[PDB]
Amino acid sequence: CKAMHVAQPAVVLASSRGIASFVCEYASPGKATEVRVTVLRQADSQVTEVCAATYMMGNELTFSICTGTSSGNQVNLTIQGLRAMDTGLYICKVELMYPPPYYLGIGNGTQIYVIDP
Amino acid sequence: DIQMTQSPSSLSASVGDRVTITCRASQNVGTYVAWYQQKPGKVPKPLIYSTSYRYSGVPSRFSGSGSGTDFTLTISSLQPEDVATYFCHQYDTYPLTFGAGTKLELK
Amino acid sequence: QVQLQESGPGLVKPSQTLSLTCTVSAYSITSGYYWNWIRQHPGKGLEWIGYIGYDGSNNYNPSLKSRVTISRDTSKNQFSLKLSSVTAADTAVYYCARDYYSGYFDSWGQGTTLTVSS
Numbered sequence: 001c002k003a004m005h006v007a008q009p010a011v012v013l014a015s016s017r018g019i020a021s022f023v024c025e026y027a028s029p030g031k032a033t034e035v036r037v038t039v040l041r042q043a044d045s046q047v048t049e050v051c052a053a054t055y056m057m058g059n060e061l062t063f064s065i066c067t068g069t070s071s072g073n074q075v076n077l078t079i080q081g082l083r084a085m086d087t088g089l090y091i092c093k094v095e096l097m098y099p100p101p102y103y104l105g106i107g108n109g110t111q112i113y114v115i116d117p
Numbered sequence: 118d119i120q121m122t123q124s125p126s127s128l129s130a131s132v133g134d135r136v137t138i139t140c141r142a143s144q145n146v147g148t149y150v151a152w153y154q155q156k157p158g159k160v161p162k163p164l165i166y167s168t169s170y171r172y173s174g175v176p177s178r179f180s181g182s183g184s185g186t187d188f189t190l191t192i193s194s195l196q197p198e199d200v201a202t203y204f205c206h207q208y209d210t211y212p213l214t215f216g217a218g219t220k221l222e223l224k
Numbered sequence: 225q226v227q228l229q230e231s232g233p234g235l236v237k238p239s240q241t242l243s244l245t246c247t248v249s250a251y252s253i254t255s256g257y258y259w260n261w262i263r264q265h266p267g268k269g270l271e272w273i274g275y276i277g278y279d280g281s282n283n284y285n286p287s288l289k290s291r292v293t294i295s296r297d298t299s300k301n302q303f304s305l306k307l308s309s310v311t312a313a314d315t316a317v318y319y320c321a322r323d324y325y326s327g328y329f330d331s332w333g334q335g336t337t338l339t340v341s342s
Contacts (some may be wrong), residue, residue: 005170025148026166027165027166027170028148028149028167028327029207029324029327029328029330030149030208030323030324030325030326030327030328031149031209031325031326031327032324032325033325071147072147072148072149073147073148073149073167074148099256099258099277099278099279099324099325100255100256100257100278101255101256102256118286142242142269149326151328151329153329158320159333160332160333160334161270161319161329161334162332163328163329163330166328167328167329180308204269206270206328206329208326208328209326210326211283211326212272212283212285212286213260213272213326214272215269215270215271215272216269217268217269218269218270224272
């Protein structure tokens with residue numbers, strides 16, 4: 001419905017293990033009660049949900065692949081278990097539910113490159 | 118409450134300068150700070166929200182900076198239309214508090 | 225687009241009850257946002273009086289909790305301020321502004337000017 005802006009880095013490298021952590025900051029209209037954050041994979045011109053979490057108070061964000069906690073405007077995200085096939089464009093989608101109204105923010109994408117040893 | 122101390126109280130500047138207005142929060146508020154432009158005898162107009170994002174329609178010369186307790190509003194290239202009074206504002210903890218205001222003089 | 229227009233008496237004698245109405249158009253109070261009242265003293269900063277939400281919920285500044293009542297008329301799309309036992313310290317320019325829950329003031333009314341004089 002109503003929209004807000006989501007910023008995230010364009011390119012992120014993995015570690016040898018498969019650690020790809022980035023920051024997803026959203027231009028919040030204000031301080032919200034329920035915020036649902038979602039990570040989306042555009043690897044093959046197709047969308048696949050990866051993370052999915054929601055918190056109904058201040059900074060109590062607790063997510064499987066995704067380890068990460070939220071700090072106000074910025075959610076600190078980490079993705080484990082990345083193979084070279086996991087390479088793709090990851091979109092951080094932020095939904096703030098309550099209080100009304102509904103604000104939706106779609107990030108341009110974080111291209112994560114993963115190789116394997 | 119939470120005190121937002123705004124400096125300078127009033128300044129003088131010529132067109133083309135780069136002016137910085139500071140607003141020091143007595144307690145940490147994170148990124149929940151906004152900047153408003155009140156023109157002489159006019160309505161306040163929101164410029165900067167989430168401490169770094171321009172309101173829809175704000176010219177690019179306006180930029181918001183700051184982290185934690187210190188916040189700055191920056192005009193890259195000053196213009197005649199920008200002569201107004203600028204206020205900072207928290208939205209992390211009720212009650213909501215503003216700054217004392219900073220007034221722009223054409224030198 | 226969302227428009228807010230203040231309305232009220234020019235002057236208020238001391239110890240009266242202050243009444244202003246903020247007529248909102250192009251958006252409905254009950255849908256979702258928090259609707260605030262703001263005054264600005266001559267020569268000082270901006271003071272936040274309080275809000276009323278879509279939910280009917282109220283919150284006022286602890287400075288002005290006892291002297292302030294903010295009420296709304298759902299049919300007319302208005303939300304009003306009631307400030308009682310006024311003093312000369314209440315001479316100010318009164319604004320009504322839209323808001324998200326603890327957020328930036330998305331829209332402002334033109335603001336109305338009120339003078340506490342005898």
